[PDB]
DNA sequence: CTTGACAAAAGTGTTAAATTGTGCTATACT
DNA sequence: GCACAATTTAACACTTTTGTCAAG
């Protein structure tokens, strides 16, 4: 069954929630659009920018460019760990300056990666993916000073790495400093060559007051334009002499250049219709005829000091409003990086024409793939834009995709964001969402974007809307920019809607974000739905408005860590979003026409569809991703049946029927237990292994090369000099293991044989040597065992020698073996779990269904959840998301509670009343009654007042049962817990960490070279650190040896930990250390500073650390 | 002359003190300058030796206890007995 | 927690001198293999095993049992350090 | 085999510090591009700073602890551990003298 | 305890002609019962064999001696057109609960274990009431359900 | 720790520096952390 | 400089900076040699005097020599000792160690105020030392050696070890530490109780001087070796002992949340 | 292949900003604590398995070996030791480590160290 | 325990091949 | 970038030492 509630009917669905990765780069592609009638901008304004090339001289100049078919599929591009690319050919002229022959020869640029169908591109066979970035928009903006109360800074600038910042700072002098690039000069002073001479520096400059003689010099008012132009210049450039038209050539590309001063469309634009008037170009000034004719310096004086001076209509600008800031997305910086890669081509031009033999030239030899190449390659991997997919689930992409960075190479850092880019703006609404962030030290600095919410060209984000008259909903649905929000007055979908129509006279809504108390005819538009008041994982939270953002904050995070499951099922209750989220995250399989299923077979789904064409669909099954989270798809459809067009074929690894599924519905028990749920921990039910719940499957990467040393070239084989026949054995034939076979930690997956460096066996060695005669071989085994800890079966084998075809390996390497291992993993104890209210907890030993909390009809909890996270934490959600789930457990109906509208107290109450009134049914039906343990428990309940007095016990368990809770029988003993205890089904999560993983320990293992010190983390097979913290805790404790143990014996010393796994093997007490050798080598580098460090005894004498060593 | 904990602990006797604490460089000079020689006092400024700290159980009062049982320490009760014989 | 300790602290007036005993004594202890101590075959500190019920090796225990006896003897200065250990490696091997 | 209760640091001087090293690196160059052995005076020589092998000379004419720190007359090299290479410097001498930006700056 | 089938390389392995994967048809074969016809067996042999398009069920065994299936309406594998697929399993007995992972096979080059829920008991629940039947008041009147599945009968158990 | 006259040999500059250091984490909600820096 | 997997080779930026002085103070050499012009001379002595302290403090002056092409600044001798990862706050006043590990934690109620879970196999890798000798004593191999391979090999770990190494347990008692290490008492030692499963169990009250929970918190587990050190460890060290605040004065292991709700 | 140059030891490797490269290289050339113990136990264990020898065989033994000065002796030295010929001490050593073989084949203390 | 006879292994000497270290060119170009 | 002297290396003819076998 299924059941939904609210009144609130979106009107416009969902859009592609995937487009802001695939549109933003589809536009900067062009690759359908023709070589003709192309749009400019994206990636051919990276060409038109770059060119013509024009320096005994030369002119290019760009025609085309061809998008180049991807030498290899998605696939193969991926197991060859090469990147997913394809050639991109490009068309340009070579011509002669003064011979007037033209010479046009199309030549070959370099490998422009192309991204997916879910929008991760592939990079060094990896799969990565571009986030989404964040700054201020390009333009005009006024700030009160910093420094000084009384006035205003204005402000120009046009984006990162495309012209430098301008700053019109007034000192306090009652002149005026323009500052640019660390440097006060006169602001007057900068007219100069920009056509303003002193008549000219009145005119509109008493159109204000006090504020005309602070901008009128003397000094250097009596030069002109071609005086003044090297005076600034000797100043704001000393490194150079001060000579003339290098004074002009060099501020011509400061700001005159519209190739070398790139100001943003959004800047033109909304600078324009800011300042009040309008430029031609992209440039702050006009290189015209010689001198410099002004665009931009004038109007934005105009605006500056009349808002200083306090005229109507010129004011401050919110430096953290959404229309201030706009979205670089992936067809921005991939273009971005283009052009500026492209000119570093363009001087890789201007210097080969520039010799050589001028006459017989073609772009043939004068371009270059590097300057370009290089430029791309270099972005789409070190930039904090781009990054490791996250396939740790469907939804996990999803948001990944979704999310905006404030960080990155032209954003900011976590040092200069203190409040103000981290805090949430009244205008966010509709667009970011002011919950979703980590919960680390970067809180608001990431967040991601709103369902509904959407990015236009110029980078402003513009959320839904519907436009209404007097009253009346109109199917107008305009997408409103952050600036057009704030004129209007908008509703709330919550608003008393009678049949398209306003039914109360006071209606909620606002201005500029400010809830106010409104009139029925002065609503001017309304909101489509709550849900774009946030983003897609907060949208899958049901009866969220029940809960506080702190919890909801890991609600939706967690789900991002959450894992897929074999039995994986959908929420008996969901918010109904689940559906277009198994769709637009593309990870399953639909009908693209009207078909017919011809058959099902789990690897190919063939369906012949009516347009008579025979289509299959071949599926992925059981395939390794990012995190190591298996990628099925559950073929659901008969050997034939017909189906219409987008109906699902199979499921995700995540998905059920076509419902996101992250974890599984068991039955919570909310009471105390031994306290073995104490603080947030949880406890569960071994019925629940039985099942196989919260079991899922997870596969690892093993790799290895046949490197050739300075000696000789290695080889992968089954032969091993001192290997015995047993571990010899899973090996098939070539010398790798099989498919399907176990692999303990420590099991030879691929062997290796290598040439040891020749180096005389020790005497006592040699001696043993020729006791068994054992021949020594030139050849030791290099082989790869699998590391401890993991282990499973072997799905794979992958491997690929070099030579072969349609594969590179590095230079010095002959093949390289990859293995897969497959591990079904059962919900251990002490492994994360978490449920959609942002309630984490590990597993705290699991419980014999024996003895077990159960009900009446022998029915035994699944959890046993601790009632105490709920009242401090604040999360009620998981308590009506349980309530509803105990009524649903005896109807089996699917409920449907959107966000911020849903069921309420009197609809679950009602629903409580029907499960109950067939449930108590079923056992007057079967031959029974009111069980004495209940009447007891319905007794000491009605001393509290728990039930009203005076009515018979089917009504007092019947207010009881609609209350959440119930009569509970404790396993072990029988007896019944003395209160009620709510129960019912519940949604729940296995998490990412698992204690199998983050577990280890080590007692002597590798040592850093530099100093003697321990490896750390996990694979290096390394001990913890003993932090200062630590030393400082000793020290308060008293602890001197235990210090020191952790100072010397196991730390860095030498002969101490060599003397400990001495003793204690022997059982001698461990000696006494003597040199942390990291201090010899702090001493030593001291000395390299030409610092002489002396160590003393007892009495001011000379004291040798280095046992004849350094003496000579 | 009063001032705040960071210049105090900068101020210190130990050169090995402040050398681990900041402005490493400033210290070092000042240091090796006059000569200066620590008589590692302090713990940290001997935790960098990696020696036994001055306080705990280290400390210089209570290492120097004897532990001796009945029947031996009587068998060395009888030791000093030997050389006035002898 | 470890029995006596109440008892144990009220003996030495620091609280590390006691730490010093226990270990010092202690090392006494597995130096000479237990053949030192002044426990009876019913104060030997044993160990219940599935297999036998042996004396308890860790010396620590030992020693903790040993000083909480008082038959122990402790003091800065109290011997010459020469003879201390010249015929404390004499009367056991 | 003596107690170490102090630290002192002082200031080395040009003639102290040739006392500390083993000897002048002059050629400003790693290993050889093939045999990966110290260049003849480069900065990770043999010859003065001690072998990469425990107890053996570079050609390998004395392999033995039984000739201890007897220095090889064929290939120079002192032959002793090799740990000895963490603790031997060297030095360059300067055609003109110069000052330390620590006191400077 | 024990499976296997001609083309298989592990749990996970995918067979031509059937919807499920092998993971799924143990997810079936742990929900199978059969019962013995003797108390004596220590284990057994189960045979298998299923071609054209049909749907497979623990019906469709291959019926011995000492053995009964108590559900020939379980569903495990739905072969489509042409689909040929051979089977065979261990069913031995035991008590209590031990996963795949505890217990070995070695049956032969493919053997996969399987998750062993043997208590034959399904649910049980007891209810204490208010009984007529003897001298004084306030006794008891113990009533004990039993739900198992065919193995054994509830009178039994 | 022990409510007893505190034992000779004692760290107690370690223990007074852990002892204000541990609540420096809760002074979010007066003059605050700043305030204790600024003493 | 040394070579890793792969082939390709690594080294110090202090090695090129050390190269990159002696090219200069060289050629300089061979200038005042062969009788150059002043200018020349004075501008590549100059060169010297900045390479000379770029070896020194690299970024005291100018921008810092870097390799060609890339951004990194190349660490100099006053690089490596101040800062925070530098030679004295990361390799002096704190270091990896030896004999040690972590993992999650959970709930102890069965568990004193002195006891602990151990997991099983952590802390066979963890006395590893002791174990060899206790099989050396306890028959079951003849030596040392043998005890070694008889178990890194083969998860044989047959009770002849899962009970031996209880007879090295029991007495001594290890140290749990959950980070951040505010209150020394974010630092106890407990019993080491070996345990099935990879999870590690603590007592529910002193959880609350390591301000841990569990939602997934993890521990660090380390072994007091010296007999000295082991005597601290459970003198001082011992959680058991330390019931007080040495802060406030007031007691710290008390009833929390489900117990002072029971009571 | 020798193109390519080195690689920076500061690389910093992953997506923070207190990671290096260099601390992730261990140490071959200085013996592990497992190994000291190792080459001790040989060097025990040869010695006492050494002692069931004849008195001019157990020499003449570690005098081919080179177990006593460091060096290898040749035949024609150990035959100048004694005063025997070179196809004396030749025989010694053959009935020498095949007379050990019995004892070991036995109590398969040394058995080990078979890599 | 010892000779004499031999073949394999380790020397010892002179070469052919290769590998590496150097000086240098000329329209003019600052 | 190249002709070429400089020096290193692998090349190889052949002498002497050292492990070794059948027979005293
Ligand atoms: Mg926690
Ligand atoms: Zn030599």
Redesign the interface.
Known sequence: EIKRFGRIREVIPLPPLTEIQVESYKKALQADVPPEKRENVGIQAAFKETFPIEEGGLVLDFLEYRIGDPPFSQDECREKDLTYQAPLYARLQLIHKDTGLIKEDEVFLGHLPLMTEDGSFIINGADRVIVSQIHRSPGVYFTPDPARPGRYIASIIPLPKRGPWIDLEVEASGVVTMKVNKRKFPLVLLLRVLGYDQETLVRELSAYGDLVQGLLDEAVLAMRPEEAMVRLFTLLRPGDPPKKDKALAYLFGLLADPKRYDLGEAGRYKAEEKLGVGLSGRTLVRFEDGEFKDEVFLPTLRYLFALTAGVPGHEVDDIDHLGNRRIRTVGELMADQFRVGLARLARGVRERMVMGSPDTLTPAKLVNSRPLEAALREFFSRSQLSQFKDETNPLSSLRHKRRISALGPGGLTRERAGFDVRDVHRTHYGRICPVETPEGANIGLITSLAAYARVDALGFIRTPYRRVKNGVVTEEVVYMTASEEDRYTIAQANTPLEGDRIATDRVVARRRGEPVIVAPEEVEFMDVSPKQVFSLNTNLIPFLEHDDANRALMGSNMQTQAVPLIRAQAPVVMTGLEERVVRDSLAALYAEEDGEVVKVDGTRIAVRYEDGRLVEHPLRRYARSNQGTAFDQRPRVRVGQRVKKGDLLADGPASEEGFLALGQNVLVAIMPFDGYNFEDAIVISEELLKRDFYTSIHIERYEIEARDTKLGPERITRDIPHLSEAALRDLDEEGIVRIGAEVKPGDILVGRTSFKGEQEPSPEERLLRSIFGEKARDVKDTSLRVPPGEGGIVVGRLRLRRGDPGVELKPGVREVVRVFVAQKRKLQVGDKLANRHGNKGVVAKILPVEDMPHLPDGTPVDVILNPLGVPSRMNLGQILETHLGLAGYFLGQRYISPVFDGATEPEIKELLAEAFNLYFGKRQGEGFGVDKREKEVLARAEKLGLVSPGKSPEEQLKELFDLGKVVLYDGRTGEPFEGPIVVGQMFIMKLYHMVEDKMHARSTGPYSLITQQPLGGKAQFGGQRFGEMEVWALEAYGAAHTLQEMLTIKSDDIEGRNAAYQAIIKGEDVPEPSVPESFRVLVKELQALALDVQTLDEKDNPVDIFEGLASK | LLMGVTKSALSTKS??SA??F????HV??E???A??????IG??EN???????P???????????????????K??EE?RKEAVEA | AEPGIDKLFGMVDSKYRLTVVVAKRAQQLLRHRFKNTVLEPEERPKMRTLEGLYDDPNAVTWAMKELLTGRLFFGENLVPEDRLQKEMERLYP | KKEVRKVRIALASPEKIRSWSYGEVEKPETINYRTLKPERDGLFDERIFGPIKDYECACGKYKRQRFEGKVCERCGVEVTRSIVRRYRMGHIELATPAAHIWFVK | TSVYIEDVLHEFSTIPGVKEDVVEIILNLKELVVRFLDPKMASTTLILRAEGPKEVRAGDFTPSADVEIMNPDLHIATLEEGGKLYMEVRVDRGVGYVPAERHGIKDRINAIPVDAIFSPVRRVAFQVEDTRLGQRTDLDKLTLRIWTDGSVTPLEA | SMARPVSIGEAVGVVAAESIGEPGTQLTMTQGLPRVIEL | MVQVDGGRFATSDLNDLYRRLINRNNRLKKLLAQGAPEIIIRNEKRMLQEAVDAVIDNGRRGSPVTNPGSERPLRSLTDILSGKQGRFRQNLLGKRVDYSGRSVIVVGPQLKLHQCGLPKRMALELFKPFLLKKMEEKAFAPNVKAARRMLERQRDIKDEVWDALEEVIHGKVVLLNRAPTLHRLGIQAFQPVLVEGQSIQLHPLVCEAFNADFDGDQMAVHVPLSSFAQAEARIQMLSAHNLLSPASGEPLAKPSRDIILGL | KIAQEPVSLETPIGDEKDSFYGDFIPDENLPSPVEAAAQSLLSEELEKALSKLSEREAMVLKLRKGLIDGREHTLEEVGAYFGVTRERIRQIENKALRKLKYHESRTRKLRDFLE
């Open positions: 050169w090995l050398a681990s900041q402005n490493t460089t070092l000079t240091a090796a300058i000569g200066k020689k620590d008589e590692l713990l940290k935790v960098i030796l990696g020696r036994l700290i306080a705990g159980t280290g400390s210089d009062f209570v290492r120097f206890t004897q532990v001796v049982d009945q029947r031996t320490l068998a060395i030791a």
